[PDB]
């Protein structure tokens, strides 16, 4: 998160940590035995840290747990990264508590102008590099179609949306890829992808989950 602030500790309770030896990419909570993600994510041997704050420490609110199984979207297209959008289940289901707790699916899509919280441990320089180890949040606002489709000519989907600040310096960036964003309490988009982090008329793309919720609770269901 490139012009965040630092969240507080367990004040994002669904927001997990994906590590496979190091954390390599966000997620949220959506109940006791599933976590969504972004399709970019997949890897194998991945154990989901929920809890955390400092990932880089074990500070006594942490639940480690292994994926039994994860899901990428059928239709995922990982060169124009359409349906950016996978399922991840825990072998065993999480203890849910006041800091670890599921986020909502939406009921229905979020408009532009709608203030959003993404969060993520991603990089927080939009030249350069430096990883927090702590997780930091962002206050942004979901931006119109035209907007987004302008920003990014032939790229922009049905199944995408833009969030974040046309001047710049505010944005997700590399790190906080699969995280949530969050609006009015109902997870509404997966950190997916941008042009560089913060850059002028570069705003954050993320997938739409709203198009997703269906496919989520029939996988749910049967798995
Ligand atoms: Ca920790």
Same mark, same amino acid.
């Given at each position: 998160?490139?012009?965040?602030?630092?969240? %507080?500790?367990?004040?994002?309770?669904?927001?997990?940590?994906?590590?496979? =030896?190091?954390?390599?990419?966000?997620?949220?909570?959506?109940?006791?035995?599933?976590?969504?993600?972004?399709?970019?994510?997949?890897?194998?041997?991945?154990?989901?840290?929920? %809890?955390?704050?400092?990932?880089?420490?074990?500070?006594?609110?942490?639940?480690?747990?292994?994926?039994?199984?994860?899901?990428?979207?059928?239709?995922?297209?990982?060169?124009?990264?359409?349906?950016?959008?996978?399922?991840?289940?825990?072998?065993?289901?999480?203890?849910?508590?006041?800091?670890?707790?599921?986020?909502?699916?939406?009921?229905?899509?979020?408009?532009?102008?709608?203030?959003?919280?993404?969060? =993520?441990?991603?990089?927080?320089?939009?030249?350069?590099?430096?990883?927090?180890?702590?997780?930091?949040?962002?206050?942004?606002?979901?931006?119109?179609?035209?907007?987004?489709?302008?920003?990014?000519?032939?790229?922009?989907?049905?199944?995408?949306?833009?969030?974040?600040?046309?001047? %710049?310096?505010?944005?997700?960036?590399?790190?906080?890829?699969?995280?949530?964003?969050?609006?009015? %309490?109902?997870?509404?988009?997966?950190?997916?992808?941008?042009?560089?982090?913060?850059?002028?008329?570069?705003?954050?793309?993320?997938?739409?989950?709203?198009?997703?919720?269906?496919?989520?609770?029939?996988?749910?269901?049967?798995?």
């Amino acid at each position: 998160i490139v012009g965040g602030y630092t969240c %507080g500790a367990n004040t994002v309770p669904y927001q997990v940590s994906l590590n496979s =030896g190091y954390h390599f990419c966000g997620g949220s909570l959506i109940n006791s035995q599933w976590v969504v993600s972004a399709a970019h994510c997949y890897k194998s041997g991945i154990q989901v840290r929920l %809890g955390e704050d400092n990932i880089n420490v074990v500070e006594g609110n942490e639940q480690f747990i292994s994926a039994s199984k994860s899901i990428v979207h059928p239709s995922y297209n990982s060169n124009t990264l359409n349906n950016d959008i996978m399922l991840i289940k825990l072998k065993s289901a999480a203890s849910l508590n006041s800091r670890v707790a599921s986020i909502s699916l939406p009921t229905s899509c979020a408009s532009a102008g709608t203030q959003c919280l993404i969060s =993520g441990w991603g990089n927080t320089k939009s030249s350069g590099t430096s990883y927090p180890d702590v997780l930091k949040c962002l206050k942004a606002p979901i931006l119109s179609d035209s907007s987004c489709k302008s920003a990014y000519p032939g790229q922009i989907t049905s199944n995408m949306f833009c969030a974040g600040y046309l001047e %710049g310096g505010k944005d997700s960036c590399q790190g906080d890829s699969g995280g949530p964003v969050v609006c009015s %309490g109902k997870l509404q988009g997966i950190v997916s992808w941008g042009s560089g982090c913060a850059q002028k008329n570069k705003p954050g793309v993320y997938t739409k989950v709203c198009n997703y919720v269906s496919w989520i609770k029939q996988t749910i269901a049967s798995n």
